[PDB]
Structure formats: C-alpha cells, structure tokens
Ligand binder design. Structure first.
Ligand SMILES: Nc1ncnc2c1ncn2[C@@H]1O[C@H](COP(=O)(O)OP(=O)(O)O)[C@@H](O)[C@H]1O
Lengths: 88, 69, 80
C-alpha cells in the first residue's frame, strides 16, 4: 500500500509523542526557513536506517532533542511508522 | 495591508475569533491560498494567535501582542 | 518503473524553475501518483502544492530551544 503516518519521540525539535497526520496519496510539508522540516525526512531515513553523515549530524548521540545546543531532552528516543496496505 | 484588513475585520464583529473559511467564502482557489499564506506569515511575525486542534477544521485567529489594535 | 518504492520523499526539486516546469512536474505527479505511487514533497513555490490534495503545516515555537508543531489542512474541497 503506502505509508499511513509517522511517530517521533525526542528527536530533532520534537518533544514527547505527537501523532503526525495520516498521509494521503500526495501531501506536502511547507514552512519558512529553519522551521524544522527536513528532519522529518531525516527520521524517515533513520527508521529505514542510514549512516549519520548524510543527516547533517555526527556520532548519532546528537540526534536527540536538545543535543545540538548541548542539553539533551533525555537519553531515550522512539521513532515509529505505520505502513497501511490493502486487505485492511 | 493584511494587518489593517484584519483590523477592520475584527471591528465588524468584535468576537475576537477570525475564521479563515469566512474570508474565502466568495473567492477562488488562488486568492484563498494567498490568504492562507497571509495568515501564516502574520503568525510568523508574532502579531496574531491562531488555534487549530483537530486534524481538519477551520483556523481560529485572535489578536496577538503586536496586533496594533 | 523498474523496481517500485511504496512511497516517495522529494526535497525541493522545484529549485530554480519557472512556473512552466513546476506546472509540468506537478501535473505529472498528479496524473502518475493516483495509481502508481505515494509521493510527498517539500517546497516553497505555491503552485507546486496548489495541485496537492492535503497539506501539512508546521509552526515553530520559541523557548529554551525550538519546538515544532504539526497541523493538517484539507485541499480536496475547492474549485478549479
Ligand atoms: N535536536 C534539536 N533541537 C533543537 N533544534 C534543533 C535540533 N536539531 C536541529 N535543530 C535546529 O533546528 C533548525 C531547523 O532546521 P532543521 O531542523 O535541520 O530542518 P529544516 O532544514 O527543515 O529547517 C536548525 O537551526 C537546526 O540546527
């Protein structure tokens, strides 16, 4: 089928658990500069798995919320997707 | 121009809640999208507070700190 | 078209284009996504996501650092 929606925890300006909306056949993510939007794609690649450098980040302990400043949100992060396919 | 248009839009009712869908009742797609981005950029300049809770509803706009009355 | 991917992510591919080329790619993805692939984009040029059927706004917020917030906007209830 396709990807229904994405769930993030303590990752790239995403405090706590927030349910991102369900994804239709063609949606879009729009916002001004520095709004924290490419990080959604970074999480998509992350749950798919890829080396840290292409996520404009090193050592993979900087990916937690608040880590680039220097004060992490916690030592604990979830990311989770739900794939929706036909046959219910 | 959009700030002053909201200044007269508030004074007509005075219910401190501006509907996005009301402003685009009698316009096409393009100007409706322009109005949506206008509310976006006015929210960016911290002049106005916009509320929307469920995934799909009309956006409620109320005067912010820099509303200029 | 050889090896399908269930869904797509597209970073700002309308980079230096004019209205004609963005109309080309938008019309292409409108006719082609509807029965082949899911595809999600990021952009700034309003015509590209004018053709979109749903929209994901994000508002950044101040504090000790930035906290971003999600809201969703329907698009398939509008004329022309
Ligand atoms: N964990 C984090 N907590 C807070 N701010 C962050 C975090 N990671 C990155 N940022 C900052 O958020 C800003 C928004 O950019 P980013 O999140 O990378 O996405 P985009 O490129 O879509 O704006 C950047 O200045 C970035 O340095």
């Amino acid at each position: 089928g396709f990807l229904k929606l994405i769930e993030i925890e303590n990752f790239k300006s995403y405090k706590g658990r927030q349910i991102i909306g369900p994804f239709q056949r063609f949606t879009a993510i729009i916002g001004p500069n520095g709004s924290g939007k490419s990080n959604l794609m970074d999480a998509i690649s992350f749950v798919l798995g890829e080396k840290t450098s292409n996520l404009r980040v090193k050592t993979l302990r900087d990916l937690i919320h608040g880590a680039p400043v220097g004060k992490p949100a916690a030592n604990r992060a979830f990311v989770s997707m739900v794939y929706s396919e036909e046959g219910a | 121009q959009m700030l002053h248009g909201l200044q007269r839009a508030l004074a007509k009712t005075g219910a401190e809640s501006i509907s996005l869908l009301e402003l685009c009742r009698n316009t096409n797609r393009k100007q409706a999208a322009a109005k949506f981005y206008s509310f976006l950029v006015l929210k960016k300049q911290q002049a106005i507070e916009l509320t929307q809770e469920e995934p799909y509803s009309d956006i409620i706009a109320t005067p912010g700190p820099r509303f200029h009355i | 078209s050889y090896k399908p991917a269930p869904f797509f992510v597209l970073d700002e591919i309308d980079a230096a284009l004019d209205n004609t080329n963005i109309g080309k790619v938008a019309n292409y993805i409108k006719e082609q996504s509807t029965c082949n692939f899911q595809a999600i984009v990021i952009s700034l040029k309003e015509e590209f996501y004018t053709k979109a059927e749903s929209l994901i706004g994000v508002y950044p917020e101040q504090g000790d650092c930035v906290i971003s917030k999600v809201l969703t906007f329907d698009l398939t209830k509008y004329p022309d």
